[PDB]
Ligand binder design. Structure first.
Ligand SMILES: Oc1cccc(-c2nc(N3CCOCC3)c3oc4ncccc4c3n2)c1
Ligand SMILES: Oc1cccc(-c2nc(N3CCOCC3)c3oc4ncccc4c3n2)c1
Lengths: 550, 550
């Protein structure tokens, strides 16, 4: 009662999923009802009661109903499969309903998956309701209709989900999605003006995509030099009237990738093509207002669902940091897959580090080209350097938590500002083609760019990682919930060892460690990675190795 | 404000010897007058005042007398030469007098050192008193009070009094002073009463015995052969009665110089071995006065152990602090004394040197296993032994590290059957090394393997232990620093090269600046490079990491 209070608070604050204390769940039970007061306790409380099969349920329902209001994130656990019960899911949905729309968007990528979880009966009921002779799905529709950008992402997520059938229960989940998608569209058609308007916009978007897909297929079909493929791409765009849509100009359409931006046309002349063998295209665009141009990318080869989830994760983590009042200048570009084997990727001006290095031997020469200050730490303006150290820190930390693999100098990008970002996300959760990842992913060039291990800045960088680590850990709970829901995603790296995937993210979190311990541990990974990269730190270890041999 | 004290709590509690305090002196001044919070505060207050005014001294003196009484260790700082004042030295001695003999003997090696610093006019005056200030009178008086103290005091003086006759400048001047002190002490004992005369007779015997022992060692070295033939000769000489002014096979009992508490009779000639080391020390057994419990010691003819005794004093003290703390690592801090230089004894703790252990069983585990086997125990080894070894290991790297002992190799570490490990033979201190190199931390692959590789409850446990050990020693810094200050003119070789740097060097290794969290991080880092360079697998892992990037 007196000191055990503290053991409760540590249990409520700390774990996202627990084996422990099933007898102590009964102990939570004893002090539960009285210490109903605070929300996170509620979710843990809901966990134990259900375990005892029958009368517990009725007693817990009242308990829940009276309980201090469950936070939005805790709700993400309830849509998840682990809780089956029908009423609790309703309450979890009530909780989402309380959340504003932006939160809804990120969560939404997860909630679409989250549909896979019951009840099938609900969907069939609604289907029969649209034509004759959970609460959640209906909720998603209603709110999906309420906001147009929201409607767009919803739609696209559904179309990818339905697209193909191939191992056994994937077919049944698919069948469920198709009906939900069809309902959604039918409600738009039955709709008051704004819905009808959003719908026509979706058909507009649909049409546009397929006509561009046909164009791309035609560009791929011709054998080619790299250059002739870009030229053919360019001429094809300019040939208005050999496609149902004419690409040099058409009706203002809201961009699928970024719905709040309308586009009229592409500019053929400006379109350039990317070096990677599966060849991504950059198209310049024209927008409804002040003829602003949008640059985006269209990739025809493979599945962006992975790339996009990882960006959702980054986007989320940046938002959390800034909410913790930390901004490391991460660049989380939007990514959408239209369908498997094609999507758009927001383009942000960048030079691939390898290209920076090819173009200029040193990274600093590069920055000094764009921003010079005479007293500035190195030829550069102080702010550019500072922002570069910051970007690195966030990115190593996230890469670490995400076990992003395959990183190399073509993968890291640099801007004139100094933000550093990562580009390609084929390898996730420790997957790597190479045999042994470094724990942390660092380039000799990047480290020399911080002024080396023996540098003032380099220290600031290290400092930043640690703190980023500590903060990200605090909001462990959201990320884990999202990943729990992303088990059946169809991201390849999740698909190989799905059950295990979430544990892998949590292992990077080292949530078991107290904070001093965590920092030390991360200190370790930096040390090894950095010694590995540096030519002199290795030479030194060698001389130390020598020592004992005589 | 209220913070005034907070800036002050940091000044009184944190630095052991500061150049730093400059302006601070005046603010301390304003506040000391109403409150003398602590014993520790007095050392701090004292630093600023004495030279500057003849009058200042009078105001400070009344402050000091009514001031809360200083802790003994802090007094050592006072005797250190910097404070010139006749009145403060008297104060320091008054504090020492209150301190119990055992603490007093521990420190004494330094006090013998302190004499040079205390003003000579006082010593000549005391001399005048006998044949035809306070500290010297105090050492002689207390020395007479306790026999062991007398014995240690005598030996320390003899070594310093015994001349090189290759004296330059003030060393020429100091010898006469030490010689005078010894002469005075010897005259007080002869003159003194029943008990003092008793001490004098015992010392006469100790002196007579050594010279006779030494004649024998010189005869043995002169004789030609490999180690075994020389040992055979040594054995014969002991047993030859009355070839010497003493009969080694039996004698009148003499208080052992290494432990005054136990007399010996006879050596046992056959029970004597010789060591692998360069100027092979004998071991002897002895008999002793009771139930013939043997004792053994070493006797080393080759070099001056003044330095070895200082290092062991350090370890003896540190162990004491930790046991005080209730952190007990199974440290072995064997008694050395020097004799008058180029002889000494060392207490013998029965141990096998690691190199020996590696040759006799394949590796350390095999060896503990042979002496202490428990099927269920960690490595089939009784739990206790592993634990004593983890701890012995931690205690030693940390202590070795603070003291910058160098030139460690397999001949240099040893084990016990209980598990403990220790070091030995420290010719190199404060980072003198024959090799151009660190490791910053001295570990052997063999020992890491002994802990069952990098991940083990045990290795991790070893690491855990080092940090706790590091923090406690950090806490008790002042005492160590004060003893080194007193050893500036020590005539210990490692100290000599730059006498001033020596105090700075331990202070620096000590790492006092950093917050504990940073101190632990700092220590963790050193262990990590030391361990990677010592494990072959770790180096391969780093190569894989360097190659990731190419
Ligand atoms: O195959 C893929 C999958 C995912 C991303 C890309 C991609 N994105 C890029 N972005 C450019 C800068 O703005 C943000 C996005 C990108 O820039 C490049 N520059 C050179 C080579 C390849 C790429 C490249 N590949 C390529
Ligand atoms: O040059 C020095 C200085 C100080 C100590 C030694 C030394 N001590 C030793 N002790 C034996 C075990 O109990 C503790 C004492 C010692 O044992 C050895 N066994 C083999 C070679 C050298 C030594 C060796 N050297 C050698």
């Amino acid at each position: 009662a007196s000191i055990r209070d503290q053991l409760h608070t540590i249990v409520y604050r700390y774990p996202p999923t627990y084996v422990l204390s099933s007898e102590e769940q009964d102990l939570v039970w004893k002090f539960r009802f009285y210490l109903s007061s605070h929300k996170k306790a509620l979710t843990k409380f809901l966990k134990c009661i259900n375990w005892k099969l029958e009368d517990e349920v009725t007693q817990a329902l009242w308990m829940l109903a009276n309980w201090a209001p469950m936070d939005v994130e805790d709700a993400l656990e309830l849509l998840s499969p682990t809780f089956t019960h029908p009423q609790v899911r309703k309450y979890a949905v009530s909780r989402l309903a309380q959340a504003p729309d932006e939160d809804l968007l990120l969560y939404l990528l997860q909630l679409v998956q989250a549909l896979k979880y019951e009840d099938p009966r609900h969907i069939v009921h609604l289907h029969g309701c649209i034509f004759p002779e959970a609460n959640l799905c209906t909720f998603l529709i209603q709110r999906a209709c309420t906001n147009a950008t929201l409607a767009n992402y919803f739609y696209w997520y559904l179309s990818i989900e339905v697209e193909e059938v191939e191992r056994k229960q994937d077919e049944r989940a698919h069948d469920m999605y198709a009906m939900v998608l069809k309902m959604f569209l039918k409600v738009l058609e039955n709709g008051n003006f704004n819905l009808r308007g959003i719908f026509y916009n979706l058909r507009k978007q649909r049409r546009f995509i397929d006509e561009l897909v046909k164009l791309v297929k035609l560009v791929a079909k011709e054998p080619g030099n790299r250059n002739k493929k870009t030229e053919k791409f360019q001429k094809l765009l300019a040939e208005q009237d050999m496609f149902k849509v004419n690409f040099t100009n058409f009706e203002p359409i809201p961009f699928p990738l970024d719905p709040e931006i309308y586009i009229t046309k592409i500019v053929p002349m400006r379109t350039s093509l990317f070096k990677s063998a599966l060849m991504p295209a950059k198209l310049t665009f024209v927008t409804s207002i002040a003829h602003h141009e949008y640059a985006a990318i269209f990739k025809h080869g493979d599945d962006l669902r992975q790339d996009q989830l990882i960006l959702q994760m980054i986007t989320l983590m940046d938002k959390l940091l800034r909410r913790e009042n930390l901004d490391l200048k991460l660049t989380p570009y939007k990514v959408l897959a239209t369908s498997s084997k094609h999507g758009f990727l927001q383009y942000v001006d960048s030079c691939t580090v390898a290209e920076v290095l090819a173009r200029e031997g040193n990274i600093h020469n590069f920055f000094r080209k764009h921003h010079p200050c005479d007293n500035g730490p190195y030829g550069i303006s102080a702010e550019v350097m500072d922002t570069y150290i910051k970007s690195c820190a966030g990115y190593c930390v996230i890469t670490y938590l995400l076990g992003v693999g395959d990183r190399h100098l073509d993968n890291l990008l640099l801007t004139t500002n100094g933000k550093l970002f990562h580009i390609d996300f084929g390898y996730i959760l420790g997957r790597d083609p190479k045999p042994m990842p470094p724990p942390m992913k660092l380039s000799k060039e990047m480290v020399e760019a911080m002024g080396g291990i023996s540098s003032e800045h380099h220290h600031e960088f290290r400092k930043q990682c640690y703190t980023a680590y500590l903060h990200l850990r605090r909001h462990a709970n959201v990320m884990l919930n999202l990943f729990s829901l992303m088990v059946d995603a169809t991201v390849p790296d999740i698909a190989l060892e799905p059950d295990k995937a979430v544990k892998k993210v949590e292992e990077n979190l080292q949530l078991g460690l107290t904070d001093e311990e965590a920092v030390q541990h991360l200190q370790s990974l930096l040390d090894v990675s950095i010694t590995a990269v540096m030519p002199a730190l290795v030479e030194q270890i060698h001389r130390f190795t020598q020592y004992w041999r005589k």
